[PDB]
Amino acid sequence: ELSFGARAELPRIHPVASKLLRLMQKKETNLCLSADVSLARELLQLADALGPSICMLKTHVDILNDFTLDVMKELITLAKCHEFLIFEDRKFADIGNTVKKQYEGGIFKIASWADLVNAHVVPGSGVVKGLQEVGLPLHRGCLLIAEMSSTGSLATGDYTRAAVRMAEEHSEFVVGFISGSRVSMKPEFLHLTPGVQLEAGGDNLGQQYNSPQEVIGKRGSDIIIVGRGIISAADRLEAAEMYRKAAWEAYLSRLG
Amino acid sequence: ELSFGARAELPRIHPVASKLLRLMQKKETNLCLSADVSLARELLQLADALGPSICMLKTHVDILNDFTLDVMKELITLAKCHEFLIFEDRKFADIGNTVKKQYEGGIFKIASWADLVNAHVVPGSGVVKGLQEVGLPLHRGCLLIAEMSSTGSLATGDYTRAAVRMAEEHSEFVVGFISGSRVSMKPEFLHLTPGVQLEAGGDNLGQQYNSPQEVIGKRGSDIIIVGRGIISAADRLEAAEMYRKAAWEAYLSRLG
Numbered sequence: 001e002l003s004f005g006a007r008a009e010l011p012r013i014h015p016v017a018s019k020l021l022r023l024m025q026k027k028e029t030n031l032c033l034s035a036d037v038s039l040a041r042e043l044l045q046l047a048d049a050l051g052p053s054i055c056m057l058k059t060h061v062d063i064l065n066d067f068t069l070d071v072m073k074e075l076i077t078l079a080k081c082h083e084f085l086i087f088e089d090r091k092f093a094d095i096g097n098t099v100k101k102q103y104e105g106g107i108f109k110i111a112s113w114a115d116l117v118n119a120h121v122v123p124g125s126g127v128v129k130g131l132q133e134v135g136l137p138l139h140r141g142c143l144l145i146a147e148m149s150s151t152g153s154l155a156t157g158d159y160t161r162a163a164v165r166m167a168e169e170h171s172e173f174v175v176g177f178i179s180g181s182r183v184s185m186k187p188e189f190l191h192l193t194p195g196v197q198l199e200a201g202g203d204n205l206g207q208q209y210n211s212p213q214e215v216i217g218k219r220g221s222d223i224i225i226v227g228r229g230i231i232s233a234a235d236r237l238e239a240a241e242m243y244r245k246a247a248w249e250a251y252l253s254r255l256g
Numbered sequence: 257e258l259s260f261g262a263r264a265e266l267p268r269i270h271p272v273a274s275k276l277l278r279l280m281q282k283k284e285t286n287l288c289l290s291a292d293v294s295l296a297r298e299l300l301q302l303a304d305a306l307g308p309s310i311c312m313l314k315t316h317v318d319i320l321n322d323f324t325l326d327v328m329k330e331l332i333t334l335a336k337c338h339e340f341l342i343f344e345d346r347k348f349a350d351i352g353n354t355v356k357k358q359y360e361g362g363i364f365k366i367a368s369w370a371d372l373v374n375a376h377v378v379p380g381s382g383v384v385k386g387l388q389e390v391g392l393p394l395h396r397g398c399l400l401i402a403e404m405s406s407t408g409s410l411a412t413g414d415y416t417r418a419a420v421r422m423a424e425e426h427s428e429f430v431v432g433f434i435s436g437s438r439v440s441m442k443p444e445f446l447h448l449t450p451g452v453q454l455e456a457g458g459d460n461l462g463q464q465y466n467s468p469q470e471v472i473g474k475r476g477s478d479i480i481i482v483g484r485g486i487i488s489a490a491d492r493l494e495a496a497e498m499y500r501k502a503a504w505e506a507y508l509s510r511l512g
């Protein structure tokens with residue numbers, strides 16, 4: 001196993017993955033904050049406060065009651081200052097011709113500010129081909145959803161293998177996976193894992209949790225994505241630090 | 257086989273499906289216009305001119321460069337005047353807790369104006385449970401994506417079977433399917449089929465086409481969803497009528 005810093009230098013590494021891996025090593029963080037909030041001011045307050053603790057800020061911009069592109073311009077300022085990537089968790093899942101427009105255009109212009117986006121592989125590889133027509137000129141990366149954390153997820157078995165093959169065949173744009181475990185043995189690919197909290201449990205709508213030690217240490221993922229585990233805490237700074245320390249120490253131990 | 261008018265009276269029929277089936281019968285249309293345009297003015301001019309020819313207008317609100325809720329108010333007015341349903345093709349595909357906010361909230365407030373939305377089944381049934389928390393008191397309906405039209409679609413076999421099961425188990429909210437063919441024998445469920453053109457072909461990003469006669473006549477679907485086959489024509493009204501007649505006659509042929 002190679003350190004994040006060494007993986008940042010791999011010959012076939014995507015530039016977006018390399019940037020992320022370098023800041024992960026620099027800041028000792030493999031925590032992605034899931035900034036699931038309804039107001040621009042809350043998104044920016046949390047990004048600023050927790051910026052030092054995170055390698056990545058994951059957005060759902062379609063849940064912002066007061067989105068404007070100015071909010072995203074300000075988010076990019078915070079990203080540059082604190083050194084984290086912005087990942088819009090849009091889960092593109094349409095035919096290639098459609099996702100191209102949903103990525104570049106409309107009100108959100110996602111490709112104009114998101115370093116990373118993700119996509120479901122269910123439509124076939126056209127979903128990647130469409131996104132990459134916009135993504136490649138704008139120097140962006142994409143994560144493919146190989147597994148889901150939720151109860152009854154169909155992203156298993158042959159479906160997961162399909163996601164890996166699609167990633168391999170689109171490595172100029174696809175930088176890795178959303179998954180519950182390592183799904184590829186190629187160290188150029190990133191693994192990001194949501195459904196993470198320190199304590200066992202779930203929510204009332206299908207979410208299931210595993211701990212940072214299980215996910216990073218035993219399951220070989222790179223980055224934990226944490227929402228309510230941090231946001232619902234009384235002290236979000238302390239919470240972000242506990243998750244960062246948990247995921248980082250789990251990564252160090254796996255590294256030996 | 258039961259006519260649309262008779263199916264609108266089935267004991268277990270959803271009120272939204274009933275309203276749709278009744279207007280399909282009254283207007284002799286089983287055509288859904290896929291209004292894939294980026295300008296509100298073009299969207300509304302299409303909805304007005306083609307309204308008498310369609311049973312449903314499918315939107316991608318996230319592609320509209322000048323979306324406002326006022327545009328959707330104008331669309332609802334035309335939908336009421338001409339008698340068609342509005343279907344936002346948002347393809348919800350996240351965990352239940354997230355899709356609930358994506359449906360109710362953000363800038364789009366999709367649930368406030370869309371009669372129908374659709375969801376991928378890949379996250380497990382939590383995706384439906386989340387949407388239904390919002391959609392049920394608003395008397396909305398949901399279509400589950402059982403099959404896709406695009407090259408390399410993973411929505412096949414056990415995946416398709418899972419979609420049908422999930423629909424059956426959530427029949428208070430799920431009114432049917434996006435699919436390429438009839439997937440359920442229950443006549444209470446609607447089957448809507450995209451990837452439709454009069455001519456053979458596809459696009460350069462994985463779309464594949466079949467004819468209205470094939471899809472409605474031989475594959476037993478209810479409604480054709482048609483985008484570029486209409487939108488790209490010089491005269492979109494003439495094109496919609498061609499598709500309406502094709503799909504309607506194919507349906508009458510299947511009745512006997």
Ligand SMILES: Nc1nc(=O)n([C@@H]2O[C@H](COP(=O)(O)O)[C@@H](O)[C@H]2O)cc1O
Nearest residue numbers: 034148149194195226227228229350354
């Ligand atoms: N497989 C997945 N599981 C997940 O839990 N997510 C996403 O990651 C976030 C969850 O953190 P938490 O569920 O609030 O404790 C949320 O924004 C959701 O949309 C996304 C996935 O692809």
Ligand SMILES: Nc1nc(=O)n([C@@H]2O[C@H](COP(=O)(O)O)[C@@H](O)[C@H]2O)cc1O
Nearest residue numbers: 095098290404405434450451482483484
């Ligand atoms: N499986 C599916 N295939 C599809 O092509 N669609 C949607 O149906 C529309 C296809 O329109 P077009 O006739 O290929 O221009 C488009 O809005 C696309 O997003 C939706 C699906 O669920």
